[PDB]
Amino acid sequence: TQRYYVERPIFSHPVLQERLHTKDKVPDSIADKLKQAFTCTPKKIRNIIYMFLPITKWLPAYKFKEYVLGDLVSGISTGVLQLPQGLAFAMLAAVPPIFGLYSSFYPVIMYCFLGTSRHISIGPFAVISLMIGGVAVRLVPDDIVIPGGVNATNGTEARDALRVKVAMSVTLLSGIIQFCLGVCRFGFVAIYLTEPLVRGFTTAAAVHVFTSMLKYLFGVKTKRYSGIFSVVYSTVAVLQNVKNLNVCSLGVGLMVFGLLLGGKEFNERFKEKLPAPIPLEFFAVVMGTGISAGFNLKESYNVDVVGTLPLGLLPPANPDTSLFHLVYVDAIAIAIVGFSVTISMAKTLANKHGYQVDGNQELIALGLCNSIGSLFQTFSISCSLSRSLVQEGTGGKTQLAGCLASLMILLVILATGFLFESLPQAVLSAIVIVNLKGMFMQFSDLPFFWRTSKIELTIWLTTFVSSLFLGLDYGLITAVIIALLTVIYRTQSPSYKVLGKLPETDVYIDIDAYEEVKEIPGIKIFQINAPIYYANSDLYSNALKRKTGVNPAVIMGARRKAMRKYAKVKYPPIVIKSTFPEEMQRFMPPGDNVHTVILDFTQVNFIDSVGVKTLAGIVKEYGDVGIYVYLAGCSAQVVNDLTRNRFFENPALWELLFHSIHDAVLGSQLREALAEQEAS
Amino acid sequence: TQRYYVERPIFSHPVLQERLHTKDKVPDSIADKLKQAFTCTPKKIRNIIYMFLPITKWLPAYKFKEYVLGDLVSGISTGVLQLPQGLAFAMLAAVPPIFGLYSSFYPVIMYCFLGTSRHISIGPFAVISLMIGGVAVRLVPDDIVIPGGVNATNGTEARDALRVKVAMSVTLLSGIIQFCLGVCRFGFVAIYLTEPLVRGFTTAAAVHVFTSMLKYLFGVKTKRYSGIFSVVYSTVAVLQNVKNLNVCSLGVGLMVFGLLLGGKEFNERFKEKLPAPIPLEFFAVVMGTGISAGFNLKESYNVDVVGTLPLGLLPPANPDTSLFHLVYVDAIAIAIVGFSVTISMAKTLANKHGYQVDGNQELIALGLCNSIGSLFQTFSISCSLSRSLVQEGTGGKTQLAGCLASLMILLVILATGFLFESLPQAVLSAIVIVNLKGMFMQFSDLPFFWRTSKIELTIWLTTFVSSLFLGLDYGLITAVIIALLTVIYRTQSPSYKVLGKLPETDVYIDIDAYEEVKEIPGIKIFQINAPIYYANSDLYSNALKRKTGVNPAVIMGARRKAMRKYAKVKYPPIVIKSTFPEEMQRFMPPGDNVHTVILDFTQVNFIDSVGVKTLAGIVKEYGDVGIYVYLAGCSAQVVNDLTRNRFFENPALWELLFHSIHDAVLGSQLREALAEQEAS
Numbered sequence A, B: 001t002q003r004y005y006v007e008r009p010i011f012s013h014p015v016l017q018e019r020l021h022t023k024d025k026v027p028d029s030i031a032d033k034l035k036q037a038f039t040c041t042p043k044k045i046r047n048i049i050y051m052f053l054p055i056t057k058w059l060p061a062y063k064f065k066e067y068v069l070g071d072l073v074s075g076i077s078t079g080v081l082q083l084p085q086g087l088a089f090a091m092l093a094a095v096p097p098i099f100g101l102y103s104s105f106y107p108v109i110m111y112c113f114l115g116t117s118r119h120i121s122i123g124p125f126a127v128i129s130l131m132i133g134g135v136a137v138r139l140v141p142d143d144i145v146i147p148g149g150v151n152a153t154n155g156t157e158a159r160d161a162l163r164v165k166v167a168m169s170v171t172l173l174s175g176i177i178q179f180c181l182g183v184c185r186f187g188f189v190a191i192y193l194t195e196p197l198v199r200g201f202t203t204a205a206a207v208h209v210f211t212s213m214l215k216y217l218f219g220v221k222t223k224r225y226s227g228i229f230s231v232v233y234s235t236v237a238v239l240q241n242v243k244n245l246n247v248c249s250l251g252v253g254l255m256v257f258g259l260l261l262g263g264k265e266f267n268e269r270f271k272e273k274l275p276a277p278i279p280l281e282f283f284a285v286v287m288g289t290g291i292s293a294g295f296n297l298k299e300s301y302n303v304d305v306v307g308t309l310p311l312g313l314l315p316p317a318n319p320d321t322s323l324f325h326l327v328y329v330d331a332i333a334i335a336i337v338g339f340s341v342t343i344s345m346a347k348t349l350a351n352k353h354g355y356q357v358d359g360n361q362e363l364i365a366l367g368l369c370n371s372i373g374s375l376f377q378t379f380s381i382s383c384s385l386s387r388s389l390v391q392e393g394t395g396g397k398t399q400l401a402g403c404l405a406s407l408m409i410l411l412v413i414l415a416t417g418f419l420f421e422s423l424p425q426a427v428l429s430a431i432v433i434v435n436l437k438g439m440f441m442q443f444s445d446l447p448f449f450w451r452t453s454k455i456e457l458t459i460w461l462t463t464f465v466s467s468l469f470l471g472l473d474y475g476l477i478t479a480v481i482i483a484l485l486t487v488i489y490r491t492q493s494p495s496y497k498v499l500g501k502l503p504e505t506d507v508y509i510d511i512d513a514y515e516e517v518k519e520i521p522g523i524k525i526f527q528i529n530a531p532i533y534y535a536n537s538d539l540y541s542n543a544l545k546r547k548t549g550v551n552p553a554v555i556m557g558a559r560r561k562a563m564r565k566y567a568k569v570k571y572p573p574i575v576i577k578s579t580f581p582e583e584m585q586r587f588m589p590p591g592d593n594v595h596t597v598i599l600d601f602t603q604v605n606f607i608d609s610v611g612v613k614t615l616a617g618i619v620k621e622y623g624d625v626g627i628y629v630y631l632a633g634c635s636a637q638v639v640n641d642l643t644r645n646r647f648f649e650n651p652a653l654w655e656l657l658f659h660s661i662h663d664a665v666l667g668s669q670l671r672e673a674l675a676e677q678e679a680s
């Protein structure tokens, strides 16, 4: 075995520097640092193509034997869920339902070619649908008259067409913004989305969607509220109008809701019994449409249905740029929110399955998908939380599962779009509510974060409140800023400790922690685990004067008190010897007689101009009353900050630095002993 | 002499903890922590009275012999400057000039009793006057007709009265806000005003005031612009209308401007020749009014003058609360800006003269001053930069200098208010411009901050730009947020270093720095001088895998490449031994053969849940390829973060911690030697 044993002279700063000679670095010209980027070797261009076109990467290396069954089952199980969710989100956007299926096919196909993550199901999203519907209603209210040959029997088809055009324009603008952000390498901002913030934002969005689904379930009409305090206004509106509900719609919605809970719990408790989970949503919609067609609930009890569904695909429609100046803000908000949600899901799924995703490629893929979708009659979309988990939980392994879902959505569009025209809105509302239960389950993080780390609990609660009451567009920004400022709070509330020396060793630990550490007499040690930047210097000085019990101001006051009570280019020395008579010392109230204060800088990352000024003031003031101050553990970075500022214009301040606490202790003790020698 | 010498066993975590026994703390009940606050000893109540009423402190201890002359000279020299500045700021607020003298007397008298700082000259401020004028014009335009018995010969007196009432209401609201903030102990926020931010904000405000003074100097009329892009719009407006200037007003303004520069430079170069500096502003206004009265410039050349000045004080006027819902935002902005500026000046003057100021008492004093001034026909004010520098520079020592200035302003109000009625606006504009030169001089910080610290230069430029183009109300908030986020940027761009061991000692320094440090073979050391919070873990992992040249992913890839090329409750061990055949090692491209990676945690202040997850992933992944990872310098705080999270559910991870880099090196070397022993 071996024991920790080192023998060496006391390493102050000048003693250590005379033993070290700076190395000569190799400068890299900014001109020669650009030439090597244009070698254009086949490997480099192949890597670039692989980066921009991930389909060329994971498709040739497709391991058939263990991917075919999982991909097929996951694709079927996610398409059967994407259909009712697509229709439901279409109605939330104040657009005809067929546009939900239009928006659930083109971007999925494009993301199967341009996407990096291989476990997310891109498609219609509830939050994006809500925001698109809000802007569509804001631009096009229910009071627009068009004399385009239509008689007095207006079916509001013109209003729906204008709303569709508004959604297309804002989607195209959001896609262009996302593409421009992606090519600008901005996707590096996704790292600021901490896990508690994402969980809180998703839960708040889940509450918004759940409360926005109540009017669809009950069947009562209610004007849509968008903006600040939207959730509370919407819920009080639906509560005021609840007296005029539709009994049959509520009954069928509650029945399918209970059936969905029963089936989901059955699958959960019979997980081992199944080779592949049964698609419950498909059975739910089949039952709903069968009953509705059986009893003709559209008119017999005034139970509104999804409506007619035209067939056939549409040729590309070149949009107009006449609405950009009206919806430019909301398009930016849509792009930011969609990218944030999709990057959070892609990152967490990649971490779970052991790989990596690219933020910039995600932005580029979303931008191209949204833009070309706007050319192809499609509104803005992003990743979907519940749908992606359903696709993965059933054995999703590559992105071909999304392609299969897109293909079956195409099949429904072309062939059996008429079959679902009688589906009541209650079934879709209950399906959305039941699939959103997984997001209600995230309240378990409240006691958990309370036990583990209260700062993250504060971030979670602040994000949830800011995204619930205020609009989702600005709640995310507010939560991000609060999360960033929590670091500032942490650096403004550090742990000031006074250290003591373990006997016979060099381990220095807090004096009030372990009952065996003993403070060295005449030497006080202070430690701060935080930088000394502008918003921290004053607190550091106050803590130094309070914890150590050595305040030069009160020392001078007591010295003058004893004085009045008894009576009835070169630089000056940093430490002024105590010009206090020994006879006057008899009238000097007792004290610890501290002769040196050691400052620990091992846990100080940086110091700025305000910090340097405060440190110089501390050194000068403490030296005024004849108390030496040494800095221990000054890293090379902090030494550079001190040198850059005006701290070291007096060369005699070089010797105050040291390398370790024990080095400073040995130096101070040796200096005291040397001063003892010449005393007598 | 003594040499650094320590002999001790290797201190891992369990070895150190078995030698330490936790002390028992003394709990302080939240109930008994409140009882001692109500002792109500005479000393405590005396201290409270001293805190709330600083006049009771520095007045009884007034040292006459060295304060009388300095206070008198400073008070005279600051009153003679406060008068023209008060009149000039009155006209900038779109109120009759007499209200400038009303606002220059009451709050100065009150701050002489309720103020803490003893070197600032409270009074009218250019920025506050500009904002008050902006809100007054916004509420009361030039198109208001009142049929209150006034004939068609309307002198716009009603419009001026409404503007005065608006200013009074907003001033009272701002005063109430300041008082409520002060009693709430909110004045603790003043620490976020770093020096570069304050300097940049003051320079931007100086530019705003200078460009707002051009129309007064030239004599041309120009409608006032308030809000975003106010400076550029105002300067292009005054440039477009310059063709209709008044020659005589410009001539007298330039003459007094040149005289002021000449006299100021004369005082600067004859500083030693004077016992007390001559008041140049008084001579300037005397000359201007003498010439204007001599030639009657009010009508002879259409040179506008300050106008008539009514005498006599006014009885208190109880305001109205009918304008709060219109000006509540601007009152809040006024309060914040005024408190920020005054606290910056008070803090810097206290630091210069060696004492301290209280932010909360400053807020309380400003709130009471503004409120009771609004009762006494006075608009909102705060500290004045140039006036305070003039007061302190001539020998201002206590707050009685402000009282003398208030008394002489009262003398002018009561007796000689008519004498200054013919003073041209050109003289006042040139006086404001010449006294604001000291704020133009602050561009010298650009090369200075460029040389010292580029981050503070970025803060300075961002503050200047955000406060120049955008309005001063929101530029301050934007600059504060940017300054706070610079810390986040600093923690996101740390300095990753790979350390080496100085021979025969225990000093570990960067391997690419000093040419004598030598890396220990088989051991790689990594150090980060930043926390490991959520927005930093990914960069830390990438830097660890790049700098040290030990990437487990590429190691596994190379191992599998050699493999395919050659062929033609208990827990598992953390480190899995390399199941790689020695024959396959012959096909394994050469490497450094690193057997242990040491992570330096001496400069890590805190770690959060994301950081803990990343650290656990690093440990597991590095142990997968048979590479031990040790943590060195884990402080008790970081150990607490790791324990609170789920890092230590496997007790075998306790031994991975250590106390110092050399301890970890010795432990790893000893473990390798022990593994060597049983090999053969």
Ligand SMILES: CC(C)CCC[C@@H](C)[C@H]1CC[C@H]2[C@@H]3CC=C4C[C@@H](O)CC[C@]4(C)[C@H]3CC[C@]12C
Residues within 6 Å of the ligand: A227, A228, A474, A477, A478, A479, A481, A482, A485
């Ligand atoms: C620490 C953080 C929160 C500081 C910055 C907060 C900013 C981004 C917040 C605080 C107050 C917010 C505003 C509050 C209310 C509204 C009205 C609403 O109809 C549109 C958004 C808007 C205008 C918000 C925009 C974002 C906002 C200005």
Ligand SMILES: CC(C)CCC[C@@H](C)[C@H]1CC[C@H]2[C@@H]3CC=C4C[C@@H](O)CC[C@]4(C)[C@H]3CC[C@]12C
Residues within 6 Å of the ligand: A481, B228, B474, B477, B478, B481, B482
């Ligand atoms: C945290 C970092 C990004 C700084 C944030 C600065 C925020 C709070 C600033 C910057 C730009 C500001 C906006 C600029 C202009 C206007 C128009 C005005 O009629 C009302 C206030 C309003 C809407 C401001 C609100 C506050 C604002 C949004």
Ligand SMILES: O=C(O)c1ccccc1O
Residues within 6 Å of the ligand: A126, A127, A202, A205, A206, A209, A384, A385, A386, A387, A432, A435, A436, A439
């Ligand atoms: O339906 C979803 O998948 C969903 C996901 C997140 C938030 C609200 C939602 O409705």
Ligand SMILES: O=C(O)c1ccccc1O
Residues within 6 Å of the ligand: B126, B127, B202, B205, B206, B209, B384, B385, B386, B387, B432, B435, B436, B439
């Ligand atoms: O007159 C001043 O002292 C002053 C100070 C700061 C900004 C504008 C100003 O006019």
